[model samples]
Target: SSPGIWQLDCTHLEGKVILVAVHVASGYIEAEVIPAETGQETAYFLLKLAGRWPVKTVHTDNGSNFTSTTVKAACDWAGIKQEDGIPMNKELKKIIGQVRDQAEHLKTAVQMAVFIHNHKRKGGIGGYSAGERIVDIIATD
Candidate 1:
C-alpha cells in the first residue's frame, strides 16, 4: 500500500472516549476508548496501535492536544513522520469524508454513535467492516 491515513476524531462522547486511526488505502480502522483526550492520552494510545501495526506516519488535525510537545516528542521517539492535517493535506480530505459519515451516525445518542460506526461495513472495501479493512493492505514493498 501507499502512504496510510490515520484520522483522529475528537468529538464529544463524554464519560467515554473515542480515538480512531483509519488506513485509507483499505478502510481499516482502529478505535479506542480512553479516559481523557489529552496529548499524553493520545500519545499512549497511538503507541499501542503502532505496536499492533508498525506505523511510519501519523496524521492529526491542528488541535492543541495534537500539537503538544509531548506528542511531538513521542512521534520523534517512535521515528514516525508527524504531519498536521491542515487545509490541503491529503489526510485532511480523508478526515472530511470520515466526519461526514460520522454526521449521519449522529442521530443516535452520543455514546451509541461510535458503536454504530464501528459495526458498519464501509464502502471502500468489498463487504469489509472498518475493522476488517486492515487486512486488505498487502504489505508490499
Candidate 2:
C-alpha cells in the first residue's frame, strides 16, 4: 500500500487551550487559542489559510476536537477534503523520525523543527525544502 501522510499533536490540551494548526503537507503552523472546540473562528482561520493552496486531502490524527462537525462542515464548504491519519501509524513515525534526526543533529528546538524542516534541512525530494516539496513554489508571504 502507498504510504499515508499525517499530522500529529503531542497533547490534546483541551481545557488548557493550546491548539496548533499544522499543515502536514507544508509543515506550516500557528498555535492558536480557539474560543471553543472547533468553532467558526477556528474553522475560518484554517480554511482561509487552506484556500492559499490546493489541499486535496488533509490527514490529521484522530483527536476528538479535530473530528468536530463544525470543522468538517467548514472544510466541506471550502471544498477541501478531510482525512483521518492512523493513530500511532508507522508512516507518520518514519517521517517524524527522519525529521527529528535532522533536528537533533542541528540542535534545534522541537517547535523550531518545522522551520528547520521547511527551510534549513534536506528532504527526500532531491534535497528540496519542505516548503518546496509541498507547495512547489517559493514566494514571500
Candidate 3:
C-alpha cells in the first residue's frame, strides 16, 4: 500500500537459503539463493540490494544474518533505515514453495519464480501484475 518500504527476509527450505525482498506497494518481489552460512554473506548482499532497489527502509527479522553490527552499519552507509517486519509474504509463502519446487536447482528456481510472480501473477495488488509498476521511479537500468 506504500512505496519505498522494502521487506527483506529469508527462508530455509530443502537445505538452501533463499533471500527474499518484496516491495510493499504493487507487490513487486525479488530473491537470491545463498549457500550454508548467513552472516557476512548476508551483509554483503544487503549493500548490494540497497543499490539495486529503491529501498528506503529495510525490514528484516532478527535472523542470524542480521544479528551482526554490520547490518546496522550498512543501514547508515546507504541511508537506508533499518527496522524489521513481516509483510504480506503469505502469497510469497505459497509462491517459492511451488516455484522453488518446479525447477531443477535453487538459483534457477529462484529467478524463474520471481520472474513469474513479477511479470505474470496478478489480481492481488491491482487488476494487473506487480511488474506493472516500474515499481520504478524510472528505467535507468
Q: Please write out the lDDT profile of model 2 over residues 1-141, one tens digit for every residue.
A: 111232434322224343445556455443433455455655665576566655455556666656777778877887766676654223223334566655533223334544544574455545765566555532335
1-141, model 1: which lDDT tens digit per residue? 454545556544425555667665655556665666889988887777767776777777777878888888887887777778732124323443455455544322332434445456766545776545555464555
Worst ten-residue run, lDDT, model 2? 1-10
* Model 3 C-alpha lDDT per residue in residues 94-129, reported as the tens digit of each score: 666677667778778778778878887465645677
Model 1 residue runs over 4 Å out of place are 1-3, 87-126
Whose lDDT is greatest here? Answer: 3
lDDT of 3: 0.72
User: For model 2, what is the alpha-carbon lDDT of residue 20?
Assistant: 48
Stretches of candidate 2 off by over 4 Å are 1-37, 85-114, 123-126, 137-141
TM-scores vs. true structure, each candidate: 0.63, 0.51, 0.78
lDDT of 2 at 122: 56
**How displaced is residue 44 in candidate 2, in Å?**
3.1
